[PDB]
Amino acid sequence: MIEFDNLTYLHGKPQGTGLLKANPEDFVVVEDLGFEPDGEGEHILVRILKNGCNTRFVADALAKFLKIHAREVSFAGQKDKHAVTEQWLCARVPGKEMPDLSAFQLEGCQVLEYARHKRKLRLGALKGNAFTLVLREVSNRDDVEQRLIDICVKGVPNYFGAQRFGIGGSNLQGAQRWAQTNTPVRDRNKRSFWLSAARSALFNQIVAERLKKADVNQVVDGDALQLAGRGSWFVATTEELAELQRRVNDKELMITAALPGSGEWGTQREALAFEQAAVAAETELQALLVREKVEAARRAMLLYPQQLSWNWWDDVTVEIRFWLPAGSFATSVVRELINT
Template identity: 45%
Template sequence: MSAISPVQTGNTLAQYPLAYLYGEPEVTARIRAESSDFVVVEELNFLPSGAGEHLLLQIEKTGQNTQFIARELARLTGLRVRDISYAGLKDRHAVTRQWFCFKWPIKQALAWQDWQIEGASILQVVRHYRKLRLGALKRNHFTIRLSQVTDSAALLARLPRLKAGVPNYYGEQRFGINGGNLHLAERLFNGESIADRQIRGLALSASRSFLFNQVLSHRLTLQAYEQLLPGDVLQLNGTGSIFAITEVDDILMQRLQSADIHLTAPLVGDGKTLVTAEAARLEQQAIAPWQHWVEGLIRLRVQAGRRSMRVVPEQLTAEIEQDSVLLRFALPAGCFATSVLRELVCYRDSARELAQMEC
């Protein structure tokens, strides 16, 4: 029996809605009516040394994506684009402060103060002893303005629930416009080749993210999102350390409730799955319709992993300003602000609507 493809005509993501933890919000609002409505500031997971062969540049950008800035830095320095590194990708339709890095001789001058980069400004430059690696972030800090809020009081009443954590879904931006990256993944799994390594990587990443979301949504639907099961794999809060359990006890349940540990779902790929027993049965049930994707990820030697099913927003606050609400919170690197927003408010994203019109 052939596997069912998740990729159909139209908006792929809309055909597979994700479950909510607290029920779909009734309050509506708009986000990113202006780029300044969505501000992201990176926090590195290390302190720059102040000395070394590499330059770290903190750049504030508006209306530009991360790759554009990397290309501009390569042009201005005469380096190759691949010589420009960064800790994470940031959305074009926002104001973001992020870090870039390249190797530059200590005794060679660099007139970076004279550079002109459209939509960007360099806030600071500091030396460091090693290259900036992808993922070298502790957290991202968000300041988000929700405009055209229909019921600010109801929104604020819902806010305290989110402080205990929300489903750690991958956001829509991971999948491209109308799930376009998933269509690319389907082509890969059907035997086509994609020469561009970056686009190929985006497609593979999107497929794993999609499958993760399906498992998480399935456990929410079965009310097993906050319930330990025999065979579950858990993650220690604030670390990448994971461990499997064979039995459930009161101590583990208390640690889960206090957010000392988190349940995980799979990042499908090649390697040991670790999950067993009842937990494994639920995961296999959730991704069974896309078994050819699982087989494709294994065949292409994408490394298997696990990801926490819960993310706890830090320093979450809200402030009412007429018909707008200003949210502030921080999330660990790799987590999506939109996963917090979707549990709080039914929002329309002006930036994504504009992007769809430009396609």
């Protein structure tokens, strides 16, 4: 299987280096939920700002504070710990008059808002995130500048960031070992982290292979094209290629790569044959996803950062900002700018 650092580049491997997350303030993330609190219900939405903590370390703190089950504290996603991130949490609390979250104190954390909500926070159920990053000690300003310019137009591969595979890659390792046996996984949490790592590694490999073609953004018969900013996708056909290619070039449609799983992958004919061949050796991982009933899905191959702007503080320091949809990583953007 293609290792993360060997994943193909769209713009080619950078010709310079730089420091990422030298300090928490150098990496700012603001979650974009997409909806407002219901204002009522058995749950309590809590918007927080943390500096050096992980969504779990804060979800547990909010758990002990409310003296509730650490499992009743949901969230849309897990923001990096080595950064200043703002995100929403959600705790299922009895009809008892909402607690005093203003009292909830924690080093590096800070409550900003809270209100009653009907349901919990489904993981991945958000619109996107806003990032503000500072790259320090950039060795090749000219290279980064040109790459930033080229990305506004062409985008970058929508690879799953490394944190998707756990520290040291433990999540992918776990998935691989479990696939070599049939011992049921008791821990539902680990089950989720491993299944996710498995399907995410496969998606990355397919994208890495597709990027080896002369024209990566060329639509072929059987491709599964997804409407920009939506889940809906449909299959391309020979007679429609010309018209479909025009919409892909205009960024109205995104060519997708498969997220292997049970059921049909989505692509057909030529596109499907390509996707199957790209991960043909990963029979065990595929069998695991299928048996655990993880439905196959589609994911945009490319990623176009929205509102991409930047400013150079000096010849070796640049601040960059952009908005990414749910499931996309800032590291996938930085990967194409510098070598860290």
